[PDB]
PDB file of C-alpha atoms and ligand atoms in Angstrom:
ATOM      1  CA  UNK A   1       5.425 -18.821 -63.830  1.00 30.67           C
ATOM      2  CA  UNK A   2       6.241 -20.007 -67.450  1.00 30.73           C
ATOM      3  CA  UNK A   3       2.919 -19.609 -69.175  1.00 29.23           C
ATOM      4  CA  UNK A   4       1.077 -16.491 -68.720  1.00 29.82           C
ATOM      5  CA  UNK A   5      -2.573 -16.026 -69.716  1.00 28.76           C
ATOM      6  CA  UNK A   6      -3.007 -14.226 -72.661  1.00 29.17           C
ATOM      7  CA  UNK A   7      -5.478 -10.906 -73.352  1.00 29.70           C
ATOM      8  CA  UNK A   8      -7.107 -13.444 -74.687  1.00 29.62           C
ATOM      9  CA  UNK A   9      -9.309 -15.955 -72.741  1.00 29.11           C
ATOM     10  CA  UNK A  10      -8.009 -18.711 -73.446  1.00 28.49           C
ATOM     11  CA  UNK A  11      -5.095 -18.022 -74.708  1.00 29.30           C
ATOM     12  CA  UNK A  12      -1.492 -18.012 -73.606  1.00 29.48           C
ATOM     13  CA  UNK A  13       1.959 -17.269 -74.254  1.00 30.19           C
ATOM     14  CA  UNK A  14       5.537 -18.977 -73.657  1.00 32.59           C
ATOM     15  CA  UNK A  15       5.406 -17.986 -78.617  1.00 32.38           C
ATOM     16  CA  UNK A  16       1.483 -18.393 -78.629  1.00 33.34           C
ATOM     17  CA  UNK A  17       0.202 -21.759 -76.654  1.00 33.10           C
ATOM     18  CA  UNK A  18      -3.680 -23.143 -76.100  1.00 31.55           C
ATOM     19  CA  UNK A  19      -4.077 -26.067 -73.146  1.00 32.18           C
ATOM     20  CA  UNK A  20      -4.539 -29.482 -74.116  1.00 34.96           C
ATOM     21  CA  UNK A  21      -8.079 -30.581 -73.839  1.00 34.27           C
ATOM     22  CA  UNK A  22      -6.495 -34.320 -74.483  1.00 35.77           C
ATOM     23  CA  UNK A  23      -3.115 -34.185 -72.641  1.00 30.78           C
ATOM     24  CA  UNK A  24      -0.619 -36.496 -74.469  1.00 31.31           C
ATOM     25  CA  UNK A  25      -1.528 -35.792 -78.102  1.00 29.94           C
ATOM     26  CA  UNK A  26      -0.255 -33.580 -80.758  1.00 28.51           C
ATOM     27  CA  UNK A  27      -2.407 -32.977 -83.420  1.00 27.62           C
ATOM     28  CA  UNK A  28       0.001 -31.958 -86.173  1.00 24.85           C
ATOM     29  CA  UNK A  29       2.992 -32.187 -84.927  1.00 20.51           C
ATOM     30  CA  UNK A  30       3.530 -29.670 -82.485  1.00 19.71           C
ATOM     31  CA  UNK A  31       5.105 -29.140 -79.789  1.00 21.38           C
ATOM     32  CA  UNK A  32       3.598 -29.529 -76.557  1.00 20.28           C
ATOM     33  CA  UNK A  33       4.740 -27.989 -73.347  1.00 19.11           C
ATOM     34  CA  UNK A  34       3.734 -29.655 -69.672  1.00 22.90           C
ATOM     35  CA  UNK A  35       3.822 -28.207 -66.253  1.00 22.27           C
ATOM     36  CA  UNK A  36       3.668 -29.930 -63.002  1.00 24.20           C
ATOM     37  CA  UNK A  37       3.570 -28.654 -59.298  1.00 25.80           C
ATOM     38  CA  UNK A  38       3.231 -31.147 -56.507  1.00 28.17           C
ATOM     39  CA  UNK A  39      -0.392 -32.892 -57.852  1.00 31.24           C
ATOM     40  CA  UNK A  40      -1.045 -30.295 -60.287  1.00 31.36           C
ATOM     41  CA  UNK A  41      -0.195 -30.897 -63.664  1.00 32.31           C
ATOM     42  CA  UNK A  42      -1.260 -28.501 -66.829  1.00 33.40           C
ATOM     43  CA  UNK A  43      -0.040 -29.041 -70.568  1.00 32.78           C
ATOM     44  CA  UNK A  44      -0.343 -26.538 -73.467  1.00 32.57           C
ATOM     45  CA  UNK A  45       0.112 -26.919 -77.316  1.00 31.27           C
ATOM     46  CA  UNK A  46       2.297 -24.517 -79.534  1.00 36.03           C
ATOM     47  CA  UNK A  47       0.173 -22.534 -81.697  1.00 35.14           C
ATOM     48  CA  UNK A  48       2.168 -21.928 -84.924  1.00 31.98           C
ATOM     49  CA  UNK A  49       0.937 -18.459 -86.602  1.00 31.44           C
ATOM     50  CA  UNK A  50       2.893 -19.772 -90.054  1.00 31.14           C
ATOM     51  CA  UNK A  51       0.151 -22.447 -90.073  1.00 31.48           C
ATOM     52  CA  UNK A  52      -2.830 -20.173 -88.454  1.00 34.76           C
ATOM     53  CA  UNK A  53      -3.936 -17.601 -89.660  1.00 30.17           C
ATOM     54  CA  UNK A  54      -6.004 -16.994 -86.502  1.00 28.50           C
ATOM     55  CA  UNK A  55      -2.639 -17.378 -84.364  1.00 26.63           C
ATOM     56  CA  UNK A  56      -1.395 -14.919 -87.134  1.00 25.86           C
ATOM     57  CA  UNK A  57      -3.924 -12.338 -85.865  1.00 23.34           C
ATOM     58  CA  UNK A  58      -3.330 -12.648 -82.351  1.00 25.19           C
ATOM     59  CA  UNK A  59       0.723 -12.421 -82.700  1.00 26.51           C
ATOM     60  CA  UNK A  60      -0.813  -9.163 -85.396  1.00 29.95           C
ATOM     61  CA  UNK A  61      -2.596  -7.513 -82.476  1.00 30.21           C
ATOM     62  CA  UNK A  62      -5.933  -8.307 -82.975  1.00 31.94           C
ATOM     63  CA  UNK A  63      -8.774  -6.294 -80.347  1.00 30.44           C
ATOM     64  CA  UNK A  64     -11.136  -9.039 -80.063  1.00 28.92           C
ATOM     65  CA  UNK A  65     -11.291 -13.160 -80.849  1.00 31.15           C
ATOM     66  CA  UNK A  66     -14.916 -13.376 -79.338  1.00 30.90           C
ATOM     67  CA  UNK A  67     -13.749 -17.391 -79.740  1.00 26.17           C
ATOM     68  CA  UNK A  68     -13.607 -17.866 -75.858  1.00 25.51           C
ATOM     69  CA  UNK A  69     -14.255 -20.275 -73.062  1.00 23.95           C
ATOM     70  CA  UNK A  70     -17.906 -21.635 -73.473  1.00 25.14           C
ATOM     71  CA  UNK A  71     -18.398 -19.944 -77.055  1.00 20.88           C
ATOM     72  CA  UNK A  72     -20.384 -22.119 -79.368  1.00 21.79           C
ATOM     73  CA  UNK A  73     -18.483 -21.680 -82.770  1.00 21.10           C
ATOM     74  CA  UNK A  74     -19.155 -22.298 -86.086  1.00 23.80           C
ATOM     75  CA  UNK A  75     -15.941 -22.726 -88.317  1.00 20.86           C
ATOM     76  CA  UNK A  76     -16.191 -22.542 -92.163  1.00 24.19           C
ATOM     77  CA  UNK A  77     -13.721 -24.091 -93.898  1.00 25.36           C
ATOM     78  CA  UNK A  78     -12.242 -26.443 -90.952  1.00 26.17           C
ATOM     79  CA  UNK A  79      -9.526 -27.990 -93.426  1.00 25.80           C
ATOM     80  CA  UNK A  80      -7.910 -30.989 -91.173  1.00 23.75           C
ATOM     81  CA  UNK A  81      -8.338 -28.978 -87.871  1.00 23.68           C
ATOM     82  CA  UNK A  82      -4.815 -27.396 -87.261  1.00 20.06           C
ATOM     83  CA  UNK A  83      -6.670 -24.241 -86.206  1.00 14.74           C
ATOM     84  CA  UNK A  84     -10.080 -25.800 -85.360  1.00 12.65           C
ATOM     85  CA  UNK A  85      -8.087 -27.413 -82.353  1.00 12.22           C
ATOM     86  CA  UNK A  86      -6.999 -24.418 -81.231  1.00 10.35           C
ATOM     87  CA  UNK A  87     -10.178 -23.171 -81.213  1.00 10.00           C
ATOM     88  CA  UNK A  88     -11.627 -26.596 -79.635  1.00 10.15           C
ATOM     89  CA  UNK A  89      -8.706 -25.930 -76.954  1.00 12.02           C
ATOM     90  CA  UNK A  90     -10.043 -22.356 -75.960  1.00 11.73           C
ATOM     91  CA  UNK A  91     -13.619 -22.699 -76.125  1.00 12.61           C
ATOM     92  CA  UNK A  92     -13.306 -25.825 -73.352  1.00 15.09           C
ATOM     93  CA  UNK A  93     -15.742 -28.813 -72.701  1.00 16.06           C
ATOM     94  CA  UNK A  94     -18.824 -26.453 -72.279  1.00 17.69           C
ATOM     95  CA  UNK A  95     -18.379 -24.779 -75.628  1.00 20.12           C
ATOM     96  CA  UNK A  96     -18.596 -26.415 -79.011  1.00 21.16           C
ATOM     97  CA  UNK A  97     -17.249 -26.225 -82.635  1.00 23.53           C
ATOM     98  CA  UNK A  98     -18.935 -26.863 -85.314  1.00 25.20           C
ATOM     99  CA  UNK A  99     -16.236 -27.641 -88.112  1.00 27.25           C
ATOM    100  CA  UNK A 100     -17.961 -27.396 -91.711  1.00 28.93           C
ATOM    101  CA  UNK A 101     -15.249 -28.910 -94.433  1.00 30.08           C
ATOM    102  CA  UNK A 102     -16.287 -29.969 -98.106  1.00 31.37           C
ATOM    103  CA  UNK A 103     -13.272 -32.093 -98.564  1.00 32.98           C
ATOM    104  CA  UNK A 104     -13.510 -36.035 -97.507  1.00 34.07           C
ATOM    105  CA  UNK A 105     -10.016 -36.552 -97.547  1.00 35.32           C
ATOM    106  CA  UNK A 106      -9.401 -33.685 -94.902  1.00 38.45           C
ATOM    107  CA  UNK A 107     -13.117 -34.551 -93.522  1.00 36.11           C
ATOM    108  CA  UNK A 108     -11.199 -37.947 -92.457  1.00 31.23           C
ATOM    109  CA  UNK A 109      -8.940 -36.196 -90.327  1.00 31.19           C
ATOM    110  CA  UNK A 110     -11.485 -33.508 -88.971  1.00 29.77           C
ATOM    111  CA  UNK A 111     -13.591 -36.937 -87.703  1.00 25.37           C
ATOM    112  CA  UNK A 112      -9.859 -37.938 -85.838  1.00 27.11           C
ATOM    113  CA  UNK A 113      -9.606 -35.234 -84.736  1.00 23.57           C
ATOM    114  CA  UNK A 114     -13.147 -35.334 -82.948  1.00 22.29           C
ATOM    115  CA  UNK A 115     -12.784 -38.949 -81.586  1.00 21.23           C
ATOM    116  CA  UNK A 116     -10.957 -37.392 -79.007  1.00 22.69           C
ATOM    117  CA  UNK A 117     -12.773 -34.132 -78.784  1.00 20.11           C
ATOM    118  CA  UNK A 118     -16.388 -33.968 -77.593  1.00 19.39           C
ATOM    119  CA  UNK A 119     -16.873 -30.468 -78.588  1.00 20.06           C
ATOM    120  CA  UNK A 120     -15.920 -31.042 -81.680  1.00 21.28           C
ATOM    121  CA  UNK A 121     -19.102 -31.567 -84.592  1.00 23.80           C
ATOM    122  CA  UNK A 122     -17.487 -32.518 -87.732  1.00 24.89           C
ATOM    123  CA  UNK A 123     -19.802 -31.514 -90.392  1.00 23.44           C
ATOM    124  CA  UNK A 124     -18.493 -32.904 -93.820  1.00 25.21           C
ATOM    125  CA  UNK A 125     -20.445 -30.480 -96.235  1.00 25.46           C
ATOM    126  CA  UNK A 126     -20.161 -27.674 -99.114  1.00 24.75           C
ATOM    127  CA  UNK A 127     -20.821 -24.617 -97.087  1.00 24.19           C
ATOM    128  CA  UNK A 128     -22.377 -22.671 -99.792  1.00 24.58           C
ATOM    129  CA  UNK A 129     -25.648 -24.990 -98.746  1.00 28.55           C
ATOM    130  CA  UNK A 130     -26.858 -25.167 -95.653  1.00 27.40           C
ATOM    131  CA  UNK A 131     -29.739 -26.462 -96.232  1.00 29.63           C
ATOM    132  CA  UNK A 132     -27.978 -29.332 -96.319  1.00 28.57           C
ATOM    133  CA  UNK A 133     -27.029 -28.939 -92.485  1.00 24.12           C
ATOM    134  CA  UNK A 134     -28.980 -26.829 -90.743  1.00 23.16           C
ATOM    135  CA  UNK A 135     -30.863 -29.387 -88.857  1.00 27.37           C
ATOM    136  CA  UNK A 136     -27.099 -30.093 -86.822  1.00 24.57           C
ATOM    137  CA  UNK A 137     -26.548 -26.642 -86.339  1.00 23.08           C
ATOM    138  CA  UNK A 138     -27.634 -25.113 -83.188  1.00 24.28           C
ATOM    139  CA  UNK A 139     -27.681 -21.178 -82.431  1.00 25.40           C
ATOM    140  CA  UNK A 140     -24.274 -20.387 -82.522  1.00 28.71           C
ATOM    141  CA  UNK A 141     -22.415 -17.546 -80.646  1.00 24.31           C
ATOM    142  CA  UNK A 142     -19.344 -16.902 -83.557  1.00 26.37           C
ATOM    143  CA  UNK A 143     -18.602 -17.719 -87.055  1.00 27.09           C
ATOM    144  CA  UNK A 144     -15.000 -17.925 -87.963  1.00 31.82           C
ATOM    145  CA  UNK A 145     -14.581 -18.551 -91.808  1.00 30.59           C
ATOM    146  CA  UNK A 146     -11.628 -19.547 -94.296  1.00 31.34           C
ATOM    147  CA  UNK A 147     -13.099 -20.990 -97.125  1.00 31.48           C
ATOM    148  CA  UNK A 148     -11.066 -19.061-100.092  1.00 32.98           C
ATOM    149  CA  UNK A 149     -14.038 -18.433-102.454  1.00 34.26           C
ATOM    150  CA  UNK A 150     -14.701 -15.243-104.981  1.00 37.84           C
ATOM    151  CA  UNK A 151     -18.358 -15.401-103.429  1.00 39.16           C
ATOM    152  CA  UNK A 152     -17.097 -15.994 -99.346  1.00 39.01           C
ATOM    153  CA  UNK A 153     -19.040 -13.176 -98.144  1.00 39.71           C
ATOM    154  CA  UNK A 154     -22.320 -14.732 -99.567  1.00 39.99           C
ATOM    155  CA  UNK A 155     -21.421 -17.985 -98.402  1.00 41.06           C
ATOM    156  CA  UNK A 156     -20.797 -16.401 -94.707  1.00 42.86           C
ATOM    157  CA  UNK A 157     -23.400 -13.916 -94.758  1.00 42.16           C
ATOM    158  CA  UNK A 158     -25.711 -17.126 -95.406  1.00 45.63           C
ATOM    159  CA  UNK A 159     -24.516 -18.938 -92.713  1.00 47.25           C
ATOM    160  CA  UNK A 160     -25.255 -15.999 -90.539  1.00 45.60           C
ATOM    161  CA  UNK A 161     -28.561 -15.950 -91.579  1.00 45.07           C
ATOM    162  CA  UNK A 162     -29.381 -19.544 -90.598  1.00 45.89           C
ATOM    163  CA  UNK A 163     -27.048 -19.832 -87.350  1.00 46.15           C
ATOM    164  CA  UNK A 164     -25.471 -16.583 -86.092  1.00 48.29           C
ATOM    165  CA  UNK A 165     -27.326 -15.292 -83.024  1.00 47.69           C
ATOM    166  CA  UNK A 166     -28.276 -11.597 -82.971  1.00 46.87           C
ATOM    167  CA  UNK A 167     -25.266  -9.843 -81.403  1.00 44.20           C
ATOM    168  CA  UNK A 168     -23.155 -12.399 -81.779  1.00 42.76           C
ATOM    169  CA  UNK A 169     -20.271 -12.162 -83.923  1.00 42.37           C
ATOM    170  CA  UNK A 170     -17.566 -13.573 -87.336  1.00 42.44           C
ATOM    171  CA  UNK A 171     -13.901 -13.836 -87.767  1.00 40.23           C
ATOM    172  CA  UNK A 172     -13.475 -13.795 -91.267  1.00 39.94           C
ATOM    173  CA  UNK A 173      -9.767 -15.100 -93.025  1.00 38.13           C
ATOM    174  CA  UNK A 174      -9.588 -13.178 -96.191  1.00 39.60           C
ATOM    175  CA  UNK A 175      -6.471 -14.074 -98.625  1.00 38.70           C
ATOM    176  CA  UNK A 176      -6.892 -11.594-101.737  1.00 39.10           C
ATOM    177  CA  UNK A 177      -6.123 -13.384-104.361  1.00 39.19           C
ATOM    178  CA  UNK A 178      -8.423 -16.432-103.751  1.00 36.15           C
ATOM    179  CA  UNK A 179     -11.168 -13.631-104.223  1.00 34.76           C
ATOM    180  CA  UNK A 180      -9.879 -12.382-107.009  1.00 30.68           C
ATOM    181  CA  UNK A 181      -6.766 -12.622-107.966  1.00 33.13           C
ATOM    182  CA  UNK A 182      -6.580  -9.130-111.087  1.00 35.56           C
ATOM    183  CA  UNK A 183      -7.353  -7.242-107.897  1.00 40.09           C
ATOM    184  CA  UNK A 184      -5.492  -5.612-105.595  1.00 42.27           C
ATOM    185  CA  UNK A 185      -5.062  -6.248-102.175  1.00 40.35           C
ATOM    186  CA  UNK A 186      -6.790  -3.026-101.071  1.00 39.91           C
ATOM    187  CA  UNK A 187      -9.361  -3.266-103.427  1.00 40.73           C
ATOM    188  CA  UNK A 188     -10.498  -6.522-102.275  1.00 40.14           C
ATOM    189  CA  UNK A 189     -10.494  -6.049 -98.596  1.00 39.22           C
ATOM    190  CA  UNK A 190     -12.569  -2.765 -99.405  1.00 38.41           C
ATOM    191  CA  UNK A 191     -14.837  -4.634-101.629  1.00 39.26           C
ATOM    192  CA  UNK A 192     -15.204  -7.420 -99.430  1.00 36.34           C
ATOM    193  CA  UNK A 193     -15.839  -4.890 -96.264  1.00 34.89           C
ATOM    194  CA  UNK A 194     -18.326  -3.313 -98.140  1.00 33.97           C
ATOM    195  CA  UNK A 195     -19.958  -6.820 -99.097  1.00 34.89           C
ATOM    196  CA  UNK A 196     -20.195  -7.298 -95.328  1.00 35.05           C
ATOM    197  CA  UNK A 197     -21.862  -4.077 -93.973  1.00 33.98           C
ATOM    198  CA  UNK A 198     -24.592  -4.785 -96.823  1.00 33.73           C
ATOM    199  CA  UNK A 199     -25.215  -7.838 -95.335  1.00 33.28           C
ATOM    200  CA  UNK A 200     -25.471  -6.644 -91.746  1.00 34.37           C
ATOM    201  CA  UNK A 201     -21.958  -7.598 -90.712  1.00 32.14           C
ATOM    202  CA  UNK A 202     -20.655  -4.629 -89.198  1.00 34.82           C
ATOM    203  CA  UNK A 203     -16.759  -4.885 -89.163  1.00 33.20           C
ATOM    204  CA  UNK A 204     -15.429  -3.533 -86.023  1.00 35.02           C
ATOM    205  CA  UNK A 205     -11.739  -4.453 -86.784  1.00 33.66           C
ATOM    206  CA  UNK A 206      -9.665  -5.133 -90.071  1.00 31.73           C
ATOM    207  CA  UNK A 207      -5.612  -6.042 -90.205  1.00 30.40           C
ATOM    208  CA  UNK A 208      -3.399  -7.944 -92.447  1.00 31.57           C
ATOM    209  CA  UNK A 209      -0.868 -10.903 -91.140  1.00 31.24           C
ATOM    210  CA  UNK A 210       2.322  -9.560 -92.172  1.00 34.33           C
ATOM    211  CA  UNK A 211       5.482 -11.424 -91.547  1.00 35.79           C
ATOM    212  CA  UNK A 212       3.294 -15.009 -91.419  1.00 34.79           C
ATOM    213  CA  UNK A 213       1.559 -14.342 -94.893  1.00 36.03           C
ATOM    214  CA  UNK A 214       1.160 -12.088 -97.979  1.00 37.67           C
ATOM    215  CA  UNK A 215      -2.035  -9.832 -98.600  1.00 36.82           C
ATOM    216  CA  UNK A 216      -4.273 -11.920 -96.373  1.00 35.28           C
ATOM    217  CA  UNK A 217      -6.531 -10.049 -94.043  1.00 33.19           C
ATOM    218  CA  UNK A 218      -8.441 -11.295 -90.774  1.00 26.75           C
ATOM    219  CA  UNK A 219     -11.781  -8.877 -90.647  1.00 27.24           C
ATOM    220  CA  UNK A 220     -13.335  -8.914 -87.123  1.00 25.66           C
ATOM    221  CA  UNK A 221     -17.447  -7.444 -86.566  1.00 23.41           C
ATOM    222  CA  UNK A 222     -20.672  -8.016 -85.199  1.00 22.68           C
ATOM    223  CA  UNK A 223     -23.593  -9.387 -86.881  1.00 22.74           C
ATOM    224  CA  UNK A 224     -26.588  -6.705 -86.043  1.00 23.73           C
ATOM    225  CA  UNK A 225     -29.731  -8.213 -88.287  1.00 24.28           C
ATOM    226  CA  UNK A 226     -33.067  -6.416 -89.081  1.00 28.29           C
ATOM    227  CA  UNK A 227     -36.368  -7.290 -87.506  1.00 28.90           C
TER     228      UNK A 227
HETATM  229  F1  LIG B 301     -16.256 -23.129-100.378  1.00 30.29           F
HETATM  230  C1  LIG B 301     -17.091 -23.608 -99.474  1.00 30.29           C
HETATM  231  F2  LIG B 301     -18.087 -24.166-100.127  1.00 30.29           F
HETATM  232  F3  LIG B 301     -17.648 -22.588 -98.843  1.00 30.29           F
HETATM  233  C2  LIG B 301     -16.421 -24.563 -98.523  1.00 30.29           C
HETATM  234  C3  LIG B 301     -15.026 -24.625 -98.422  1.00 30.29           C
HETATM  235  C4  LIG B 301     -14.519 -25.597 -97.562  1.00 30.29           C
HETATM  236  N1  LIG B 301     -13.188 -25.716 -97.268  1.00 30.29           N
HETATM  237  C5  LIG B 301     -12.095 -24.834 -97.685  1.00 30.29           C
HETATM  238  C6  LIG B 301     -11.000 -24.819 -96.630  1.00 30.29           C
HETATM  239  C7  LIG B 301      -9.861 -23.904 -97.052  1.00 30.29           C
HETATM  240  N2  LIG B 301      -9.327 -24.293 -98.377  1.00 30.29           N
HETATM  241  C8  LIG B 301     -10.380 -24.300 -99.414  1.00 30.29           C
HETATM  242  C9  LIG B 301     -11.517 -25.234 -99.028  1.00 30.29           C
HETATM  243  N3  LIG B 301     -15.333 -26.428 -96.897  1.00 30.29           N
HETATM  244  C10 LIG B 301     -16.642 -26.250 -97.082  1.00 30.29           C
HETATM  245  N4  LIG B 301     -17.265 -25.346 -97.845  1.00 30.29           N
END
């Protein structure tokens, strides 16, 4: 047996590997790994943790994902989709990702991306409004977030507000000096920790991503709102 399941659901390793919801394609090159048994056949996609900082996290040690088979996600920050298909990979056809991206030129490759996807909602917007979007947004179960902004925490904790269900939960990408970059790294992961709890986002985990980056922290909690 080649490919063992991950802690993870979802997840796998042998070097971290998702399966292929569309057999055949790479999305960014990687490599892609297929394994076939009489009539059974299974292929799985390299996850590279030098271009994922969610793949960083697992490789780190990370307790919890709470991005799992069936999860209804909603991804700030979905860039072109490297991670986003990883996360589209795990979550499977019953689950969905919402991928929220302000650029058009990487918007372009998010709506590729989703051709081939059918969990896959590209949502082409500035996530700092969603007002804009809320109407497309279903309850979701998980925000994961990477949108490099001074004010991230406000723009998550506002998301949460409109879309996170009670209980559910946020994986939060936090690269220091995109928050503010006369800081330390310390004293922005406290400050930004602190943001959180104030905003009913109870962190429940907190590590950094040493050897695949520099000062960058993944924060993992539970979102526990008032009456
Ligand atoms: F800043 C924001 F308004 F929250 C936002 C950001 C965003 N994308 C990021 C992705 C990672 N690099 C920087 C841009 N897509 C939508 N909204």
């Amino acid at each position: 047996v080649m490919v063992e399941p991950h802690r993870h659901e979802g997840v796998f390793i042998c070097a971290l590997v998702t399966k292929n919801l569309v057999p055949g394609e790479s999305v960014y090159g990687e490599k892609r790994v297929s394994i076939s048994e009489g009539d059974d056949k299974i292929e799985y996609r390299a996850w590279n943790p030098f271009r994922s900082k969610l793949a960083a996290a697992i490789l780190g040690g990370v307790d919890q994902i709470h991005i799992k088979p069936g999860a209804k996600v909603l991804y700030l920050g979905a860039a072109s989709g490297t991670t986003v298909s990883h996360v589209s990979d795990i979550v499977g056809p019953d689950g969905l990702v919402y991928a929220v991206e302000f650029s058009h030129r990487s918007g372009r490759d998010l709506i590729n991306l989703a051709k081939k996807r059918t969990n896959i909602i590209p949502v082409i917007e500035d996530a700092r409004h969603p007002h804009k979007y809320r109407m497309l947004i279903a309850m979701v179960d998980v925000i994961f977030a990477d949108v490099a902004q001074p004010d991230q925490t406000r723009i998550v904790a506002l998301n949460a507000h409109t879309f996170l269900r009670n209980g559910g939960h946020f994986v939060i990408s936090i690269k220091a000096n995109c928050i503010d970059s006369t800081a330390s790294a310390e004293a922005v992961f406290a400050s930004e920790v602190k943001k959180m709890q104030q905003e009913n986002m109870k962190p429940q985990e907190q590590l950094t991503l040493e050897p695949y980056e520099r000062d960058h922290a993944v924060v993992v909690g539970v979102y526990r709102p008032p009456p």
